[PDB]
Amino acid sequence: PYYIPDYKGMEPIGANIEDLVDYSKDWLSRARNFSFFEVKGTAVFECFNSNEANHCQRYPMSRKPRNFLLIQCSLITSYKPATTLSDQIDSRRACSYILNLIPDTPASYLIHDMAYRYINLTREDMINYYAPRIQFKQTQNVREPGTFKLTSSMLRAESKAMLDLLNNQIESLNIASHIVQSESVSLITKILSDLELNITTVLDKFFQNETQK
Amino acid sequence: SESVSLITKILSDLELNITTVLDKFFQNETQK
Amino acid sequence: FILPSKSLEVAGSFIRFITVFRIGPGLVDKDNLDTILIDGDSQWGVSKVMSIDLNRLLALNIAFEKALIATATWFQYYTEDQGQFPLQYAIRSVFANHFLLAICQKMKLCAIFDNLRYLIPAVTSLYSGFPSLIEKLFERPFKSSLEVYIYYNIKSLLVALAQNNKARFYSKVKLLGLTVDQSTVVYPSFMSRIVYKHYRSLISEVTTCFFLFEKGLHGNMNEEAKIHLETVEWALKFREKEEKYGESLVENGYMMWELRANAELAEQQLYCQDAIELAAIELNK
Amino acid sequence: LEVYIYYNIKSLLVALAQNNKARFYSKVGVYPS
Amino acid sequence: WASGESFIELSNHKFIRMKRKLMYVSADATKWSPGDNSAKFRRFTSMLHNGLPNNKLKNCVIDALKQVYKTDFFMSRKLRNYIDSMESLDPHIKQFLDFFPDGHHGEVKGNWLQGNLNKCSSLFGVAMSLLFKQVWTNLFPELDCFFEFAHHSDDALFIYGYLEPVDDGTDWFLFVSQQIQAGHLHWFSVNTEMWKSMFNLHEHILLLGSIKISPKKTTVSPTNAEFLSTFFEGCAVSIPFV
């Protein structure tokens, strides 16, 4: 039933192709610059070096390469997936190991304080610490499973100061320096080398022969 | 730039892989 | 050791923790630890209070699976390229590389691999626009040693790829069904000691590395301000052209004689009515 | 070859002069190969 | 075309041998770019030939294009909240806020903001490339050049066929100089590396229709099995399985 309305549209204009040809003749008569650069091998090196210089000019330099490894860890043997019993045993041994060391920095002081607090938990507290919520019961220290409360009394001055700090410019590495690049390549090469040391149906046939092998 | 590119190409081409008790220490460390 | 922190289910929250471990081979960076507690022939390193968000936490949770999947992808691509199973050395090298890249989720590395995806073909071809792609690499600061390592590898790889274009000679090959004069020219791997046969395998390696970075950091506010500013800048340029040349001329487009008398009108966001008419005629034919 | 060797020497010496000085007068390091 | 050979005709019934060579250009010409005048499509659809007897549908399309011209861009809530703090970078942030009169929405013109106009834009690009082909053929009727392209989604592949001297002698240079002095001024851009002039004219003609070949991410290579194979694989697969 509906009928498409009138609207306006547009009327043609005289466009002469030969006019474009004349314009192109005038344009090509002069000299123009190609917009792409020939790859050479020397040209890429020169571009990298020039941009290195520009980058160093643009940003303030820094001498402290910031952290990248978000979880630092180490293994020497095979790893068995952690269970709750192994977790309890390992936490006991870890607190025993921590109590031997002497802290040097506020983070280390907090580390020692928390290990001490863990080692000073009562048997009912430890039972509820590793117990499921179904059997979990409120205690004096273990408020929720797998956690414990820690008031300011146990922490020392350094740990308290670091906690106070926690509770509360743009600069790049000198990419053009030989020392920075060499130190970076050596560090990441060492990490990668330590990451490869060996540790002390019908589809299944091809899988076991090629991929699994 | 061109000289360093040429020499780096040569160096990388040269690195490409191709398919008694003192003897014990030697075979363990230097020969390995 | 898990310090108290805001709940991770509230958006924008962080969980603050600290690790103590026995110093040994593995994911150890000595210079970025808080301190190393010496003992009786054993050194215990303690990290600094590190806070991570939910996205980074979930990315770290599946680092092993992501690294294994990327390694198996590289395995398939290597067999497709060469035709034989790689030796255990290359396999272990690429697994270490993929694991380290999956561990360290940072925006600079994601951008670096994204640009390298288009940098490799730009230096494989004869001419290209590689200077702009190189300049794209130096937009954000290099903060850590991993970024400097990856930059160094990229620079060496790109120079090596561009050097192959000095030995281009004309040969005879059969494409489809015709024997034609092609222009031929190594292709070093990015994460091993092998050499590839086709550079497409190099591009695939780089792409696999690019996709090891989670899309969560792909939508950071730093990457949203960019698109906002891009649209606003182009709108302002359009306004400038509008006020310099008049609204009707910009919206409707200039004629041929205006272009021939000005020659500065040939620009983006300005179109020639005669050219559009002629192109319509050529397509109508 | 001579030019390449000279370029490597120049880069290494510039880097050493820039770095080792700051790693010298602190009191009584890193040297690239 | 490359297999055969080309012979040019000098005035005194003479032939000069020439070697035909190709070089291909890959570009994402029809990829949406933020700086673009959607109004350029109105005259295009006013003049494009369709089998329809009337102009009701064509004029309706033109009216839709007219209405989509001006768009009200809106600043996202996160950016608005964030911008209330850390205004140290005053220059560009101040300009950006000046773009918004009331601080919530501004006016955007020309740019159609990533709207789905893929086929329309690709057809426009094909039209402009055919226009360049016609213009170049008109420019050098004597020369036996070549140009063929084929779009695929947001990609393209422009193949330029050009002529190079075979004897490395000055006969080609002499002919070019004679043509130049005879009045044909445009032959100045043909004696050496004519494919560069072919591509420059092509890119300029595209720019006349607001299309801009990106100075990055476009690669130009001669006949090469690897370049063609990677282009065809990129055409075949859109997403990496990884």
PDB file of N, CA and C in Angstrom, chain C residues 122-151:
ATOM      1  N   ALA C 122      56.702  -5.572   4.994  1.00  0.00           N
ATOM      2  CA  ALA C 122      57.123  -4.247   4.490  1.00  0.00           C
ATOM      3  C   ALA C 122      58.608  -4.272   4.137  1.00  0.00           C
ATOM      4  N   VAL C 123      59.380  -5.171   4.745  1.00  0.00           N
ATOM      5  CA  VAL C 123      60.792  -5.306   4.414  1.00  0.00           C
ATOM      6  C   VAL C 123      61.058  -6.495   3.521  1.00  0.00           C
ATOM      7  N   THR C 124      60.096  -7.402   3.369  1.00  0.00           N
ATOM      8  CA  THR C 124      60.242  -8.466   2.382  1.00  0.00           C
ATOM      9  C   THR C 124      60.038  -7.981   0.948  1.00  0.00           C
ATOM     10  N   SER C 125      59.131  -7.034   0.729  1.00  0.00           N
ATOM     11  CA  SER C 125      58.808  -6.585  -0.617  1.00  0.00           C
ATOM     12  C   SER C 125      59.930  -5.714  -1.175  1.00  0.00           C
ATOM     13  N   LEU C 126      59.707  -5.170  -2.371  1.00  0.00           N
ATOM     14  CA  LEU C 126      60.728  -4.349  -3.016  1.00  0.00           C
ATOM     15  C   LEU C 126      60.706  -2.919  -2.493  1.00  0.00           C
ATOM     16  N   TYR C 127      59.604  -2.211  -2.709  1.00  0.00           N
ATOM     17  CA  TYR C 127      59.354  -0.927  -2.077  1.00  0.00           C
ATOM     18  C   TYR C 127      58.198  -1.090  -1.104  1.00  0.00           C
ATOM     19  N   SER C 128      58.154  -0.194  -0.137  1.00  0.00           N
ATOM     20  CA  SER C 128      57.073  -0.243   0.862  1.00  0.00           C
ATOM     21  C   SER C 128      57.107   1.047   1.668  1.00  0.00           C
ATOM     22  N   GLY C 129      56.335   1.098   2.733  1.00  0.00           N
ATOM     23  CA  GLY C 129      56.322   2.251   3.604  1.00  0.00           C
ATOM     24  C   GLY C 129      56.906   1.922   4.956  1.00  0.00           C
ATOM     25  N   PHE C 130      58.021   1.195   4.964  1.00  0.00           N
ATOM     26  CA  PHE C 130      58.580   0.731   6.225  1.00  0.00           C
ATOM     27  C   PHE C 130      59.038   1.835   7.177  1.00  0.00           C
ATOM     28  N   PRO C 131      59.495   3.020   6.745  1.00  0.00           N
ATOM     29  CA  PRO C 131      59.897   4.024   7.747  1.00  0.00           C
ATOM     30  C   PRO C 131      58.804   4.393   8.737  1.00  0.00           C
ATOM     31  N   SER C 132      57.556   4.500   8.283  1.00  0.00           N
ATOM     32  CA  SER C 132      56.462   4.817   9.193  1.00  0.00           C
ATOM     33  C   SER C 132      56.218   3.682  10.178  1.00  0.00           C
ATOM     34  N   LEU C 133      56.285   2.441   9.702  1.00  0.00           N
ATOM     35  CA  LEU C 133      56.086   1.305  10.591  1.00  0.00           C
ATOM     36  C   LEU C 133      57.209   1.203  11.614  1.00  0.00           C
ATOM     37  N   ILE C 134      58.435   1.550  11.222  1.00  0.00           N
ATOM     38  CA  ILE C 134      59.529   1.594  12.185  1.00  0.00           C
ATOM     39  C   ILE C 134      59.281   2.678  13.219  1.00  0.00           C
ATOM     40  N   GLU C 135      58.855   3.862  12.774  1.00  0.00           N
ATOM     41  CA  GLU C 135      58.585   4.944  13.713  1.00  0.00           C
ATOM     42  C   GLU C 135      57.496   4.564  14.703  1.00  0.00           C
ATOM     43  N   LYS C 136      56.548   3.729  14.282  1.00  0.00           N
ATOM     44  CA  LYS C 136      55.506   3.282  15.202  1.00  0.00           C
ATOM     45  C   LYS C 136      56.063   2.507  16.389  1.00  0.00           C
ATOM     46  N   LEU C 137      57.278   1.967  16.280  1.00  0.00           N
ATOM     47  CA  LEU C 137      57.828   1.162  17.365  1.00  0.00           C
ATOM     48  C   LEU C 137      58.252   2.014  18.552  1.00  0.00           C
ATOM     49  N   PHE C 138      58.588   3.279  18.321  1.00  0.00           N
ATOM     50  CA  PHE C 138      59.141   4.149  19.355  1.00  0.00           C
ATOM     51  C   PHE C 138      58.117   5.139  19.881  1.00  0.00           C
ATOM     52  N   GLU C 139      56.858   4.729  20.005  1.00  0.00           N
ATOM     53  CA  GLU C 139      55.822   5.628  20.489  1.00  0.00           C
ATOM     54  C   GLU C 139      55.688   5.613  22.003  1.00  0.00           C
ATOM     55  N   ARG C 140      55.877   4.466  22.638  1.00  0.00           N
ATOM     56  CA  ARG C 140      55.793   4.389  24.083  1.00  0.00           C
ATOM     57  C   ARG C 140      57.160   4.075  24.679  1.00  0.00           C
ATOM     58  N   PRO C 141      57.411   4.467  25.925  1.00  0.00           N
ATOM     59  CA  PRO C 141      58.725   4.221  26.523  1.00  0.00           C
ATOM     60  C   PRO C 141      59.013   2.740  26.701  1.00  0.00           C
ATOM     61  N   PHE C 142      60.292   2.392  26.581  1.00  0.00           N
ATOM     62  CA  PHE C 142      60.772   1.052  26.902  1.00  0.00           C
ATOM     63  C   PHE C 142      61.099   1.025  28.389  1.00  0.00           C
ATOM     64  N   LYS C 143      60.351   0.234  29.152  1.00  0.00           N
ATOM     65  CA  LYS C 143      60.449   0.260  30.603  1.00  0.00           C
ATOM     66  C   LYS C 143      61.279  -0.876  31.182  1.00  0.00           C
ATOM     67  N   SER C 144      61.170  -2.084  30.643  1.00  0.00           N
ATOM     68  CA  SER C 144      61.800  -3.253  31.235  1.00  0.00           C
ATOM     69  C   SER C 144      62.811  -3.859  30.276  1.00  0.00           C
ATOM     70  N   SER C 145      63.500  -4.894  30.758  1.00  0.00           N
ATOM     71  CA  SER C 145      64.522  -5.557  29.957  1.00  0.00           C
ATOM     72  C   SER C 145      63.925  -6.470  28.898  1.00  0.00           C
ATOM     73  N   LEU C 146      62.736  -7.019  29.142  1.00  0.00           N
ATOM     74  CA  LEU C 146      62.091  -7.843  28.127  1.00  0.00           C
ATOM     75  C   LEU C 146      61.790  -7.028  26.882  1.00  0.00           C
ATOM     76  N   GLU C 147      61.329  -5.795  27.067  1.00  0.00           N
ATOM     77  CA  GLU C 147      61.021  -4.943  25.929  1.00  0.00           C
ATOM     78  C   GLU C 147      62.274  -4.608  25.138  1.00  0.00           C
ATOM     79  N   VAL C 148      63.385  -4.342  25.823  1.00  0.00           N
ATOM     80  CA  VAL C 148      64.631  -4.056  25.119  1.00  0.00           C
ATOM     81  C   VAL C 148      65.126  -5.292  24.378  1.00  0.00           C
ATOM     82  N   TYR C 149      64.984  -6.469  24.988  1.00  0.00           N
ATOM     83  CA  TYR C 149      65.365  -7.712  24.324  1.00  0.00           C
ATOM     84  C   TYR C 149      64.550  -7.928  23.056  1.00  0.00           C
ATOM     85  N   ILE C 150      63.237  -7.720  23.144  1.00  0.00           N
ATOM     86  CA  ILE C 150      62.372  -7.923  21.989  1.00  0.00           C
ATOM     87  C   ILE C 150      62.670  -6.892  20.910  1.00  0.00           C
ATOM     88  N   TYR C 151      62.939  -5.655  21.321  1.00  0.00           N
ATOM     89  CA  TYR C 151      63.309  -4.606  20.335  1.00  0.00           C
ATOM     90  C   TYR C 151      64.588  -5.018  19.619  1.00  0.00           C
TER      91      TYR C 151
END
